[PDB]
Amino acid sequence: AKINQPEYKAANGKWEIIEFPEKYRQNTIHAALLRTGKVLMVAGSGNNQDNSDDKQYDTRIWDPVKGTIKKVPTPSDLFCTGHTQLANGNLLIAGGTKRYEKLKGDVTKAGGLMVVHNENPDKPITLPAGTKFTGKENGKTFVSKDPVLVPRAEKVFDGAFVRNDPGLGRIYVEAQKSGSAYETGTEDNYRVQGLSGADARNTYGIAQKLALDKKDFQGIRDAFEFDPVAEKYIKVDPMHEARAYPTLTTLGDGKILSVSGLDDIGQLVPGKNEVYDPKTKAWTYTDKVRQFPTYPALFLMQNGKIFYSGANAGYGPDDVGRTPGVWDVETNKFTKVPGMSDANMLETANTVLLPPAQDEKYMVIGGGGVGESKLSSEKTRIADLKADDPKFVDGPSLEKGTRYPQASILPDDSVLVSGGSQDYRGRGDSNILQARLYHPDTNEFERVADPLVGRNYHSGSILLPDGRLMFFGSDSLYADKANTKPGKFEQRIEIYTPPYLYRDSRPDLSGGPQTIARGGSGTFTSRAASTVKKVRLIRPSASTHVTDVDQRSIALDFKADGDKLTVTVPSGKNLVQSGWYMMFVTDGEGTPSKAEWVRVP
Numbered sequence: 001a002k003i004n005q006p007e008y009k010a011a012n013g014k015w016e017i018i019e020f021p022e023k024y025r026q027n028t029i030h031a032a033l034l035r036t037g038k039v040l041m042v043a044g045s046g047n048n049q050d051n052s053d054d055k056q057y058d059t060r061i062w063d064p065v066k067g068t069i070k071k072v073p074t075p076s077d078l079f080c081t082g083h084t085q086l087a088n089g090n091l092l093i094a095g096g097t098k099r100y101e102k103l104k105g106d107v108t109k110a111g112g113l114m115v116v117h118n119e120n121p122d123k124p125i126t127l128p129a130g131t132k133f134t135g136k137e138n139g140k141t142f143v144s145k146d147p148v149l150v151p152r153a154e155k156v157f158d159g160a161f162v163r164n165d166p167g168l169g170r171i172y173v174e175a176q177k178s179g180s181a182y183e184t185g186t187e188d189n190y191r192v193q194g195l196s197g198a199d200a201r202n203t204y205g206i207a208q209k210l211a212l213d214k215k216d217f218q219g220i221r222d223a224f225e226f227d228p229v230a231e232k233y234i235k236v237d238p239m240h241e242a243r244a245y246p247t248l249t250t251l252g253d254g255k256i257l258s259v260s261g262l263d264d265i266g267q268l269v270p271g272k273n274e275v276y277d278p279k280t281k282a283w284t285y286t287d288k289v290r291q292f293p294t295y296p297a298l299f300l301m302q303n304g305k306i307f308y309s310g311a312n313a314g315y316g317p318d319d320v321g322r323t324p325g326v327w328d329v330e331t332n333k334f335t336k337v338p339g340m341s342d343a344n345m346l347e348t349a350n351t352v353l354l355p356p357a358q359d360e361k362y363m364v365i366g367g368g369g370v371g372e373s374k375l376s377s378e379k380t381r382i383a384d385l386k387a388d389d390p391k392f393v394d395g396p397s398l399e400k401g402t403r404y405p406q407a408s409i410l411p412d413d414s415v416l417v418s419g420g421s422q423d424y425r426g427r428g429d430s431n432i433l434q435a436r437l438y439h440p441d442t443n444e445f446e447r448v449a450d451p452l453v454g455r456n457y458h459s460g461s462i463l464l465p466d467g468r469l470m471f472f473g474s475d476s477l478y479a480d481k482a483n484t485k486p487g488k489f490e491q492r493i494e495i496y497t498p499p500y501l502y503r504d505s506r507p508d509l510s511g512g513p514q515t516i517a518r519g520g521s522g523t524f525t526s527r528a529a530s531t532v533k534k535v536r537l538i539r540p541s542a543s544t545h546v547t548d549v550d551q552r553s554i555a556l557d558f559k560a561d562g563d564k565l566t567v568t569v570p571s572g573k574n575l576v577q578s579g580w581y582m583m584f585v586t587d588g589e590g591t592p593s594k595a596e597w598v599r600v601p
């Protein structure tokens with residue numbers, strides 16, 4: 001196909017690779033558009049064992065207008081963090097990792113770390129090599145290769161006796177036979193074969209997935225605010241819980257909820273959630289437990305409750321926190337939302353609050369089966385949360401089952417859905433080089449230009465102020481279709497220019513940056529004011545692991561008079577979260593202006 005011709009671009013847009021000078025390359029795993037118009041690109045150690053060992057941590061700031069890039073000193077391994085924009089435009093970033101060593105054993109046999117629990121405070125227990133552990137739910141058996149000493153449970157005192165904290169002993173376990181049939185994909189509690197009586201009651205294992213991509217993966221408590229003006233990470237109070245892969249999401253009071261993650265020995269945080277108050281720069285536990293898998297897609301609804309779409313990055317059990325629903329964080333009540341197709345393929349799915357955000361329609365896109373499953377979903381599922389009895393209904397389908405699809409809201413109310421892979425971490429060279437625009441008004445997909453670079457695990461996408469989009473990342477497990485050689489992280493970046501920039505001249509817009517309060521108005525200059533049909537306030541993305549709880553596009557009422565455009569911000573802090581937004585105006589041809597920045601107090 002002649003993809004650079006004017007007619008083709010007018011219908012399909014165009015992709016371009018940017019490669020950075022080698023000095024500035026990194027394995028970008030998170031990115032966020034900052035209110036300065038620059039993009040924060042966070043690698044941390046970049047899922048690179050050498051960098052993890054050396055404590056080599058990387059961040060960049062990229063100026064898309066100037067093309068320039070700089071390094072930012074990175075104080076901790078911010079790979080594996082959660083992050084969201086605060087009301088002042090700083091990016092709260094919390095959690096991370098201190099380890100993800102590849103585990104040694106037979107590469108053809110499922111395995112990983114078993115955390116053995118000893119509830120007996122009176123004695124330790126040693127389990128010899130060749131101890132068999134059987135998943136109480138999964139029915140699968142794994143064998144240790146070395147002995148493990150599990151310490152006595154530690155008595156905890158006020159000095160009155162409270163309880164016993166179980167002794168914990170980690171040990172590598174492996175399937176007896178080769179092959180994927182012996183893998184697990186979710187946490188289970190494991191029976192230790194050969195114990196009886198008290199030892200049986202008191203000794204059991206907990207393990208996350210025991211499969212072929214084997215890692216010892218541990219969280220940290222660190223938290224920072226990234227200040228986009230200073231261009232630096234500012235240390236704030238650490239979280240109470242160590243968390244690799246938490247979601248951070250803004251509540252109706254403007255405080256930030258931190259949910260889930262793996263703890264400091266690789267166990268799922270057991271529903272112990274916490275709230276950051278930006279006014280105190282401190283964290284407080286919520287009162288009651290509510291457990292989810294990692295990177296749960298959690299969005300603030302107009303009634304102040306949190307919508308969990310079901311999309312997540314995995315870990316934890318298959319039967320807690322896996323159903324979509326509406327969570328009242330203050331009461332802790334959770335009400336499941338029915339109707340999700342491919343409810344067994346929600347790991348690595350994307351979630352978008354469709355434009356306009358007023359409508360409270362959420363779309364879940366693609367996904368795959370738990371852990372290293374070969375299952376992948378071609379479906380979209382849409383829930384309308386304004387309904388009295390909300391439910392998911394299928395939307396338009398993709399051509400192929402797709403893990404890891406990128407999904408970015410555009411200023412014309414389309415959603416760009418691109419990339420992903422048909423299988424786990426792109427294995428079998430399964431990157432899908434396809435892009436589509438979802439049109440909420442027709443409920444259909446329109447195929448657009450194919451991306452140039454494949455993007456699976458550890459990818460993402462960011463809408464820029466000029467209306468183009470940046471795509472980053474991709475961490476294939478293997479380099480080849482045969483799955484014999486290790487993959488190399490994708491360091492190339494792409495810019496996608498949508499069809500709307502291959503049309504007539506775009507509307508002009510000036511008068512930013514401005515502060516405009518909810519329920520208030522601001523006036524801008526546009527010579528093309530009388531052509532404007534839509535005004536959108538779009539929250540900048542913070543994207544990682546197929547998860548972006550920041551992006552949303554809010555419709556604004558407006559009036560044009562001559563070259564003056566007056567816009568009014570909607571009421572409701574649950575809708576228009578405080579913070580910085582891109583304001584785009586779009587004409588009757590569907591062509592957007594470049595954005596002006598608007599701060600909502």
Ligand SMILES: [Cu+2]
Nearest residue numbers: 049052053101
């Ligand atoms: Cu290491």
Ligand SMILES: [Cu+2]
Nearest residue numbers: 047080458545
């Ligand atoms: Cu990751």
